[model samples]
Target chain A: PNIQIKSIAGITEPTILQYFATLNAGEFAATAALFAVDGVMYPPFESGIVGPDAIAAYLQQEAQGIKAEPQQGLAETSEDGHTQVQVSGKAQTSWCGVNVLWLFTLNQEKQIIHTQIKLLASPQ
Target chain B: IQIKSIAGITEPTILQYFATLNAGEFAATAALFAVDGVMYPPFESGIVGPDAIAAYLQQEAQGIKAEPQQGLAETSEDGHTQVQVSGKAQTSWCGVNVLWLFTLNQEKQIIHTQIKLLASPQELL
Candidate 1:
């Protein structure tokens, strides 16, 4: 029976960590490849963004003219099998310089659906 | 919230029957059904009326000492109000897992109560 709309064969915390690492490394193409073609990406406090091209462009824009490093951790998994990853770390940049915490949700297809980013105080 | 009915009885009258159940303190919780309200619990015959419903719950409550934990309340697209309750209980026979679904009437009282056990293999192993 075609009862299941989507199924996750396997998922590991390390795989999600690797994805965050790619994002932090400014490897937009590699990061975007982890998602399905018609996948959607929604950043916190922003509108819904779609497609690998848009995601790649957004990551490139955020990574450009700024050297920043963000730490990531997988917090919890949803009942429907989505993984919630919490990202927090200090970023060294001229304009938006601060520590931040971000929550990201990755669906069964490994696509980033939701993200919420909040700024913290200056790094001590 | 006010309760409009119970089992098959209407407002105020149903409140008398609802006051006797151990489910919750308020008449609001008990009075939330029509006098001839129908209830379906897992592995049990459907029960009707505030008195029968109260009697059933009273016996079950005394026998099992079950508790109901309220959860997020959501409204469906069709405008039905649904609330989930999760908790645990101790029965005379064995410990039990508890999960409840409530469909509420316009008066904010539950029109339907669905109860079940949530036993997983991990818990047994």
Candidate 2:
């Protein structure tokens, strides 16, 4: 069993790191493409979004203002062939950040299934 | 900070948890948890077992100088019983409001736990 640790600034699994980058950079279509046909993404509004189309729409609403905050070891992935990687970052227009540590729950095929994004913005 | 309440988890029981924790009565506090309980602060991973729980509290949750000054607890209705505990505490690393979400099992022991440093989103900046 090997433990994979990539430099936080570098990218490896497109499903985890690259997808988050897309979301943060406002690339909604690109982000949705990283998911499976039935993949689900949970936005902070208690929104349970499924499929690429819905996921893309959700990202358009949310990631339009998010960006990856700098912190070393900001990325980690499992070594069981393919693995999940937890993401934590901020939105330029929002307060606080989001860190739902299910490793983003993806597949060996790099298709994201289910993950939570509720910790993004704080309560009003 | 604000904590809403869910059913099957009384405020008194939660209060007792804080009291036991502050007393440094590690075993007692651990008793309130399930055999496979998991609880830890944010920005890190968690461990199971009452023994590990005590050790975690000893090392991370509370150090030699750790103390609970005051806290607030409330529940939020969702899957499982979600309870939020917040307030001041004397912890190493300076300390933050400590927003803890304890997901209780039917037995009322902490079945799942998630922690985040700083305040909840609404209270966030």
Candidate 3:
């Protein structure tokens, strides 16, 4: 059976799996469209990016030449009820590849509202 | 059907925690943490250990105060992992409705933390 979404939206596990797959594959527009119209993205580049056009543009530029392959992931929630997905894996770039952890929090509509990335350790 | 002991240390310690902070007791505030505890504030690298944690708290508390709101704690279901704390907090330059979270120990010490404020990106930067 498909992983239960745990929310009103049809935000099952596959919905999130597809999100990363598209973003990592450089599908900027599609990636941004996955979010709600008013969704907010807290990426490493900008302080905050909202709307599909802005999110797409931001990812297309700042996220260019980057790749992330998931190692493990856990879905959870914040105290204020934000759906969360924490995934740690190998993130590669033209300059280097290292272990990185991505904390994604989703809004009630299943739109990702925050993305906080932390470098887990120096690449060997 | 069954009952529990999740209330081992957090309730009273949390009362002391905010109480000490309310009085801006630098050393007293620090004493509430484990020796090697971690304080992770938003947009800041973690401050580790009681010494640094105390210093950080002291600095923030100097001539500054906020209405620390209600707080709650919960031990994990099976009592294996770290206990959790969640509450509201604030500061002068930031907005209210902040998030205060901690991992307290049975040793009556806060061993880990995450404190989030409603501050803007520019303020955090």
Candidate 4:
């Protein structure tokens, strides 16, 4: 039997997968809509980005001319009830521009609440 | 069960109820709630009326001194109250570190209270 997955309104695993795929393809607007109106994102090792508008603005300002491709991974739920997805990928951009891994957590309301992106010592 | 009506519960008022109760004064605890107010658990069942609450506490005061510490409170979306209270109680029985989760009705009286034993250094280890 196939396993069934649950998701909040406007957010499903496939939706998030496609959103990240677009982000890897450098589509910022599509990625920002994946967040809710009052959603928040806390980047590990940095401050948090709050609200959809702020997130979209930050993405536009900071992620210009950047693209990423997933290496290999899957998303899973945490013990504390957050949807966690891990992505190991390579990026092409002026900033850092190396292989990176990002972990994201979404709340019950299907809003991306936390994220951690790190540069790996070696690419897979 | 879903709460139908809440009479006197407010964010600041709930904290006042907890603070005044912590004073450990018989009069203070008795005056904390309405005449027909109720306290559930640890106290167990209900202590109806101010005089009853006072008499109950006066009897309780002979055995234990409960000092509340490290308290936190939050209001539900529909305005019910939840409070996590941690405290130490020194009694002839033992010194116990206790944690209680209280759900208070709109009247600021405890409708349900759940208690847990966190530590008891006096008991052993």
Candidate 1 C-alpha lDDT tens digits along A26-80 = 5455455445456566654677667767777887776554433555444676899
Write model 2 residue lDDT over B23-85, tens digit each, in one string.
444444454455566776566677775556656665554453223333444444543456765
- The i-RMS of every model, in angstroms, reads 24.4, 19.5, 22.0, 24.9
Top model number, lDDT: 3
User: lDDT for every model?
Assistant: 0.51, 0.52, 0.58, 0.55
- The residue pairs that clash in candidate 4, if any, are none
**How would you encode candidate 3's per-residue C-alpha lDDT over A1-124 as one tens digit per residue?**
0111111122233335435545554556645654666777776544878777888788887887676676677787667866788777778886878787777777654456666777777545
Q: Give Cα distance to truth, residue A95, candidate 3, Å.
A: 2.7
Count of residue pairs whose backbone atoms collide, per candidate: 12, 10, 0, 0
lDDT of 4 by residue, B11-70 (tens): 333343343344433443343344445555464676665456556666665555556666
CA-RMSD of model 3: 20.6
Better of 1 and 4 by TM-score: 4
Question: What is the CA-based DockQ of model 1?
Answer: 0.01
Docking quality class, candidate 3: incorrect
Tens digits of per-residue lDDT, candidate 3, B1-117, equal 001112333353454455546654444445456656788877789987656766787566565444554445567754413534333454566445566677766434567777666
- lDDT per residue as tens, model 1, B79-99: 656766566666678776777
